[PDB]
Design a protein around this ligand. Structure first.
Ligand SMILES: CCCCCCCC/C=C/CCCCCCCC(=O)OC[C@H](O)CO
Ligand SMILES: CCCCCCCC/C=C/CCCCCCCC(=O)OC[C@H](O)CO
Ligand SMILES: CCCCCCCC/C=C/CCCCCCCC(=O)OC[C@H](O)CO
Ligand SMILES: CCCCCCCC/C=C/CCCCCCCC(=O)OC[C@H](O)CO
Ligand SMILES: CCCCCCCC/C=C/CCCCCCCC(=O)OC[C@H](O)CO
Ligand SMILES: CCCCCCCC/C=C/CCCCCCCC(=O)OC[C@H](O)CO
Ligand SMILES: CCCCCCCC/C=C/CCCCCCCC(=O)OC[C@H](O)CO
Ligand SMILES: CCCCCCCC/C=C/CCCCCCCC(=O)OC[C@H](O)CO
Ligand SMILES: CCCCCCCC/C=C\CCCCCCCC(=O)OC[C@H](O)CO
Ligand SMILES: CCCCCCCC/C=C\CCCCCCCC(=O)OC[C@H](O)CO
Ligand SMILES: CCCCCCCC/C=C\CCCCCCCC(=O)OC[C@H](O)CO
Ligand SMILES: CCCCCCCC/C=C\CCCCCCCC(=O)OC[C@H](O)CO
Ligand SMILES: CCCCCCCC/C=C\CCCCCCCC(=O)OC[C@H](O)CO
Ligand SMILES: CCCCCCCC/C=C\CCCCCCCC(=O)OC[C@H](O)CO
Ligand SMILES: CCCCCCCC/C=C\CCCCCCCC(=O)OC[C@H](O)CO
Ligand SMILES: CCCCCCCC/C=C\CCCCCCCC(=O)OC[C@H](O)CO
Ligand SMILES: CCCCCCCC/C=C\CCCCCCCC(=O)OC[C@H](O)CO
Ligand SMILES: CCCCCCCC/C=C\CCCCCCCC(=O)OC[C@H](O)CO
Ligand SMILES: CCCCCCCC/C=C\CCCCCCCC(=O)OC[C@H](O)CO
Ligand SMILES: CCCCCCCC/C=C\CCCCCCCC(=O)OC[C@H](O)CO
Ligand SMILES: CCCCCCCC/C=C\CCCCCCCC(=O)OC[C@H](O)CO
Ligand SMILES: CCCCCCCC/C=C\CCCCCCCC(=O)OC[C@H](O)CO
Ligand SMILES: CCCCCCCC/C=C\CCCCCCCC(=O)OC[C@H](O)CO
Ligand SMILES: CCCCCCCC/C=C\CCCCCCCC(=O)OC[C@H](O)CO
Lengths: 406, 408
């Protein structure tokens, strides 16, 4: 049973890698650049999961298990996890799958993420988690077809409604907005509509299989990394979530390689390793304090209508916003080289290069992250210019050619 | 008492950084390049430590505590630790102080070193350590002024001699060879003679203070990294050796910064991270299997005349050699420039040598480096080729331009 985590994690990783599904980017870019592509993906997926999780519970394939409510932990830990997201150059699922893509910064961030989460759970930061534990809400639900006994409060349970009703109302609202609203364009072939459907299916598969293996929950990140570290350092057995992490990495790597997008990568400046290192530590403290991360709380907990998960997600986003302001703000006439610069940067340095350019000029942009080669084309068409061709130099490296137009 | 580890480690770290004392380089370059500078440093320090450890035991400031003999562990672990050295681009002390010099590769290699050693002591590789433990030799010494009760066999104990006698004989032979033999030349101002005296003084100080904190041993590395990880991950208290590691890093960092040699650094090719990560893991498994590392066994154990330490050191060197073969088999006109910034030492020296030979008479050679050891080795490699170094200028902090005029 436990070995189904490797399979679910493998599929999870392919979807994350092919879709460029980075929630840290989704929260950040909806503030910095009014980009909602990844936010539409998130909302549509949450909507599908809302319908799927209650449907799968109805027919007896799983029970929902909302995480307990803890206002101090969910808020403070949520917020601190939001800060670390931006510093580490991605949320925990994003860091995890970028490991298999070949980014050494993500190797660094995952190490400090795992160690910091381990340390907050049972080591040098245990005292903090103990202090936060006193503020846990005693509110719980009773065993039913929908809920594991003793789980945390939901929108349904507070309202006294069958979980089907808020699930359908909220999802329909989510879908109305996702579809009745304009979305930022991207060149991703694995587009946000079909990625949402795949991601939710993988989500349901994970809740089912993980439950059979004795972990009554769907996809998560933080507990998988702690299960792996416990295994290596204490010889404890691996569990479903530990194997899911392995699967994510392996799946993202396979998917990157087959797409010719795998490449061992380094940042432009060495100090980034210090940044993503501190960032990963903040994430480990935040996630453990909060009781879950971008996946455990947001992708998996929100569609269960868990109050803890809605609350922690609000502060995931506010922390992301705080840290994002702290950190941010063929002839060939000019050449900009943004290889190894953090995923916001290539789009920003290519926008500023097209603006600070004369008409008819041909600009070369050098990138080595595939998310940017599907974002810069749209930023270019909304500036008057047009992309001539995206040519692959090395594997995992692409040259973008732009003809400026007024 | 435990806090004296930070002090001793801080001093230990300064001496390593200033002297460029990297034993992995010491073993490798004596085979690759017939370079014996760092090996005279090691041999002289060992000699000074042999006299010092016994003298300090005589007057009651410490007792020696030779590590136990284990042929399977000391040989196989020593050899595996040898392979890891070269892959990680530095031994365990070299990786540790390079963390303070700002090498992100050292950060990486330390992480996998600490985790691999922890996993070998009590995690997923403990099965191997258990299997090795069955071969432990029951040989041991009795409590005396010289020895902790139950410590492992020494040259003295096997010979039935007062520890002073093999100590003075072997050290005198070491000092004869060190001073009666030519040594490879270097530009290091903290030269191998004055560095050996300081290193041995710091070594003795560590043996004294650590013993007062309840760890009857001198300088080590692997235990401190495990003590650190245990504290962070399980909330256990830090001991003298964990604080010694912290000291080492702080010490090298201050020393590098004051010398204007500190710089956050990246390797030339990203795969180096995979390399040094695997290397650090090999070191963790090897050091724990061997019962000690370049410091715990070689620097601290050999002067105690501990059979375990002499034996494991033999295979540290054999493993280093094996891996060394697998792996290594201003206005100035400037005719050609070689940029070896971020390339792993021996490479700057190697690519600078090849560049001078593959060049025409009178050509001006610009070598770009960013590791401070290389700027004291390349000058001698150049003079033994006929050419001469015009000037070594500082480009960035931690970065140097070497200008070579090629003759004939
Ligand atoms: C296992 C061989 C390769 C190990 C490379 C470790 C490098 C350092 C990374 C640490 C965190 C993740 C470590 C995950 C390693 C697998 C988990 C493990 O050791 O499992 C033990 C098992 O559960 C007992 O029954
Ligand atoms: C804590 C971690 C536990 C362990 C997790 C391990 C998961 C599996 C690894 C995936 C990486 C995949 C590597 C893919 C390498 C691709 C190489 C490539 O694409 O080479 C191109 C070249 O140009 C020739 O065509
Ligand atoms: C040869 C290298 C250069 C010269 C280096 C000289 C260093 C000092 C010499 C010490 C050896 C003394 C040996 C004899 C000591 C007296 C006899 C003795 O102690 O005998 C013990 C007995 O055999 C059992 O307990
Ligand atoms: C108390 C009894 C035991 C003492 C134990 C420790 C002894 C250390 C010194 C040994 C002799 C060293 C002689 C070295 C003389 C110099 C080297 C030499 O002869 O030639 C080189 C040249 O003359 C100059 O650099
Ligand atoms: C009784 C034992 C024997 C006596 C032990 C005495 C204490 C140890 C040495 C202290 C400082 C040594 C470091 C100094 C090394 C040379 C420094 C130097 O040359 O610095 C000048 C300038 O700042 C750059 O060129
Ligand atoms: C107290 C503040 C600690 C900040 C840690 C940031 C670095 C985290 C990296 C982990 C790998 C290196 C492990 C060494 C960690 C030493 C610090 C530590 O927590 O030691 C245990 C503590 O002293 C027991 O009470
Ligand atoms: C987590 C494992 C244990 C970690 C233990 C850490 C102990 C303190 C050492 C830090 C590095 C060295 C000190 C920092 C040196 C900074 C030098 C610097 O910034 O130099 C500026 C430059 O010279 C232009 O002005
Ligand atoms: C244990 C060491 C640290 C591990 C940290 C997490 C690793 C996660 C997976 C990465 C794929 C690694 C293998 C795939 C890449 C191989 C290198 C490559 O593609 O090229 C190498 C070149 O051919 C010759 O140097
Ligand atoms: C370990 C790293 C932590 C990093 C982050 C530190 C943030 C600031 C600290 C605390 C805020 C506490 C906020 C809540 C405090 C009041 C809770 C409360 O109600 O206290 C009274 C109680 O209900 C009846 O005694
Ligand atoms: C149970 C969930 C039902 C969800 C129904 C969503 C319908 C979306 C269509 C909108 C029309 C305008 C599109 C522009
Ligand atoms: C329950 C209702 C839904 C059931 C079905 C859910 C699973 C869909 C299956 C595969 C994903 C396909 C991803 C879309 C892109 C496929 C590839 C493509 O469009 O072109 C590739 C190109 O030709 C170069 O390989
Ligand atoms: C049952 C799983 C799939 C449910 C959703 C399938 C349809 C969503 C996609 C596109 C609609 C048209 C967009 C214009
Ligand atoms: C029981 C249900 C199990 C889960 C079923 C849902 C599908 C999971 C896998 C999707 C892979 C999608 C791969 C998409 C690759 C797109 C190709 C691309 O982007 O090429 C450029
Ligand atoms: C788990 C190991 C996953 C990675 C296994 C592949 C490592 C070898 C590799 O990447 O080979 C690339 C090749 O050398 C390019 O020509
Ligand atoms: C260590 C033993 C296991 C080794 C690992 C074997 C994993 C299974 C292999 C392939 C299935 C998944 C295929 C994933 C395809 C990703 C999407 C993709 O890139 O599709 C091609 C497209 O043409 C690009 O544009
Ligand atoms: C609400 C409690 C917040 C507690 C945590 C605040 C962290 C602030 C930022 C540190 C990053 C520094 C990065 C330095 C990189 C050089
Ligand atoms: C096993 C892991 C061990 C620990 C691994 C982490 C590193 C520890 C050492 C030094 C940190 C501080 C180094 C100095 C920080 C400033 C350096 C500098 O000059 O920064 C310039 C930059 O542009 C400004 O943003
Ligand atoms: C974790 C693995 C570490 C790497 C291990 C690689 C070497 C394999 C060991 C063979 C030892 C045989 C030694 C002889 C056995 C004892 C002889 C006897 O039985 O007496
Ligand atoms: C009683 C116990 C005493 C124990 C401690 C004994 C002395 C240790 C020396 C440390 C500083 C070394 C200074 C290094 C000088 C650097 C000079 C240099 O390279 O200048 C450029
Ligand atoms: C870790 C303890 C030492 C931390 C030192 C940080 C120094 C620093 O901020 O770097 C220098 C400065 O930023 C640029 O002039
Ligand atoms: C916070 C903790 C701060 C600790 C600072 C304490 C002592 C520094 C003294 C040792 C400095 C290392 C000397 C290295 C060196 O090079 O000194 C000679 C100089 O280069 C010739 O110009
Ligand atoms: C007694 C038992 C002895 C043996 C026990 C331990 C076995 C490990 C052996 C060799 C590892 C060789 C180094 C492998 C490094 C990984 C590949 C890599 O990093 O590839 C790129 C690199 O640059 C290419 O040289
Ligand atoms: C230092 C002793 C530590 C403990 C034992 C570890 C193994 C020693 C290595 C070889 C044994 C034979 C040594 C024979 C004496 C001369 C050695 C020699 O020539 O030194 C190397 C180099 O050639 C100079 O240029
Ligand atoms: C049976 C032995 C198997 C292991 C491998 C041999 C042991 C180490 C050899 C080093 C010589 C390196 C090659 C020559 C370098 C000359 C400089």
């Amino acid at each position: 049973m436990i070995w189904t985590g490797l399979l679910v994690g493998f599929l999870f990783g392919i979807v994350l890698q092919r879709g460029r599904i980075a929630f840290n980017s989704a929260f950040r870019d909806v503030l910095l650049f009014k980009d909602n592509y990844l936010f539409k993906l998130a909302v549509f997926t949450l909507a599908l999961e809302m319908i799927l999780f209650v449907l799968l519970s109805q027919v007896g394939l799983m029970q929902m298990n909302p995480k307990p409510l803890n206002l101090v932990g969910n808020i403070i830990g949520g917020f601190v996890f939001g800060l670390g997201m931006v510093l580490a150059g991605g949320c925990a699922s994003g860091v995890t799958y970028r490991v298999g893509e070949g980014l050494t910064t993500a190797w660094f961030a995952a190490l400090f993420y795992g160690l910091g989460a381990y340390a907050t759970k049972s080591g040098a930061f245990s005292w903090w988690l103990s202090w936060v534990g006193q503020f846990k809400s005693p509110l719980s639900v009773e065993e039913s077809a929908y809920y594991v006994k003793g789980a945390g409060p939901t929108i349904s349970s507070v309202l006294g409604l069958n979980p089907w009703i808020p699930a359908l109302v909220i999802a329909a609202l989510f879908i109305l907005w996702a579809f009745g609203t304009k979305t930022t364009s991207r060149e991703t072939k694995f587009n946000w509509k079909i990625a949402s459907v795949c991601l939710a299916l993988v989500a349901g598969l994970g809740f089912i299989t993980s439950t059979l293996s004795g972990r009554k929950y769907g996809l998560g990140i933080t507990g998988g990394w702690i299960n792996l570290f416990q295994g290596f350092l204490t010889n404890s057995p691996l569990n479903w979530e530990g194997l899911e992490i392995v699967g994510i990495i392996l799946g993202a790597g396979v998917a990157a390689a087959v797409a010719g997008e795998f490449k061992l990568r380094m940042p432009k400046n060495p100090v980034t390793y210090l940044q993503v290192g501190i960032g990963g530590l903040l994430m480990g403290i935040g996630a453990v304090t909060a009781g879950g991360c971008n996946i455990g709380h947001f992708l998996t907990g929100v569609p269960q209508l868990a109050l803890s998960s809605w609350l922690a997600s609000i502060f995931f986003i506010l922390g992301n916003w705080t840290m994002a302001w702290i950190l941010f703000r063929y002839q060939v006439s000019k050449e900009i080289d943004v290889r190894g610069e953090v995923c916001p940067i290539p789009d920003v340095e290519a926008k500023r290069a097209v603006q600070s350019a004369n008409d008819g000029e041909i600009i070369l942009v050098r990138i080595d992250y595939p998310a940017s080669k599907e974002r810069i084309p749209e930023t270019v068409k909304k500036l008057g210019s047009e992309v001539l061709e995206i040519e692959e130099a090395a594997p995992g490296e692409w040259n973008i050619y732009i003809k400026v137009k007024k």
